Amino acid sequence: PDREKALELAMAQIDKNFGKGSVMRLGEEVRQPISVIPTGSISLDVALGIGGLPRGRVIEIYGPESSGKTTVALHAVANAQAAGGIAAFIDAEHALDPEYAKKLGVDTDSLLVSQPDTGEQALEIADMLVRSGALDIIVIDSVAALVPRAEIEGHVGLQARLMSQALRKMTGALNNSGTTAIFINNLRETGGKALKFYASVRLDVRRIETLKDGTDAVGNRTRVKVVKNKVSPPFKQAEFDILYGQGISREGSLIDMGVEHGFIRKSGSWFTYEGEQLGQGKENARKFLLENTDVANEIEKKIKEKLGI
Ligand SMILES: Nc1ncnc2c1ncn2[C@H]1C[C@H](O)[C@@H](COP(=O)(O)OP(=O)(O)OP(=O)(O)O)O1
């Protein structure tokens, strides 16, 4: 009684019992469900397997201070908006900057922003906003800031239940609503034990290295390791460039990928897309595509095919 056919026989018994991707073969490039939201990072998009954050899924983006977490999230908001979506930001950090947001594609003016007082009020006005079935994406700034009713008033219990409760009720909510929920986490190098088991995707955003280009510093090179993923196979990672005051670099992203995929070449550190050269050094080819969007288009259109959709 053949293993191969005796494995899938039962391995299939599992999905049917515990969900879609409860058991995946790290090798499979399967792709049966989409309605995903581009993260504006072609590299991270593919690393996700479904070319973006699955909608209707609770997502967690954790990492140290100044890693790129929120930038990605706002980048998520930018797209879900630019496609006729309604985005809500449950600010509890009071740090969000419109000026930087708007410069990334966020229709600030028409962005719902609620500034809770208690961790409970936050998780409510959020779970409640989700139920209205109007939102497409909702991101919550600072899982840390979500402090309970008391504490704010006066070991003795924990907030980590405040998360299990609202998450229990809210996880099933956005499930049949199609509203993807981003939760932003932080520095340790609590309630994070409940979210770690609900998120259908959990990204680990660490700032791999500092971008310079001969002046002071512009942005940073960020690396993201999708450690949990129930839509596609996990453990894949991606890198990209985040320029100070401009966001993620689509242009420079097309290059990193362009070459890693053999569409552009590198003789003497001189990037060139078949026949016509771009320039020496990366920060210069980035400045090349930054002007001619046609040449960058076909390059974006060539990589779009080379991989899953
Ligand atoms: N308001 C802004 N104006 C200009 N550049 C900014 C602004 N906010 C952030 N940046 C740039 C410089 C930061 O080094 C870079 C990455 O920061 P961010 O992507 O905000 O990190 P982060 O999201 O991991 O930190 P946090 O824990 O607060 O979410 O974005």
UniProtKB/Swiss-Prot annotation:
Pfam families: RecA (PF00154), RecA_C (PF21096). SUPFAM superfamilies: P-loop containing nucleoside triphosphate hydrolases, RecA protein, C-terminal domain. InterPro entries: AAA+_ATPase, DNA_recomb/repair_RecA, DNA_recomb/repair_RecA_CS, P-loop_NTPase, RecA-like_C, RecA-like_N, RecA_ATP-bd, RecA_C_sf. Keywords: ATP-binding, Cytoplasm, DNA damage, DNA recombination, DNA repair, DNA-binding, Nucleotide-binding, SOS response. ATP binds at S66, S67, G68, K69, T70, T71, D97, P98, E99, Y100. Its main location: cytoplasm. Phosphate binds at S66, S67, G68, K69, T70, N186. One of its GO terms (cellular component) is cytosol. It comes from the Bacteria. GO terms for biological process: DNA recombination; DNA repair; SOS response. Belongs to the RecA family. Polymerizes non-specifically on ssDNA to form filaments. Interacts with and activates LexA leading to autocatalytic cleavage of LexA, which derepresses the SOS regulon and activates DNA repair. Required for homologous recombination (HR) and the bypass of mutagenic DNA lesions (double strand breaks, DSB) by the SOS response. Can catalyze the hydrolysis of ATP in the presence of single-stranded DNA, the ATP-dependent uptake of single-stranded DNA by duplex DNA, and the ATP-dependent hybridization of homologous single-stranded DNAs. Numerous X-ray crystals have been resolved under different conditions which indicate the flexibility of the protein, essential to its function. This is Protein RecA.
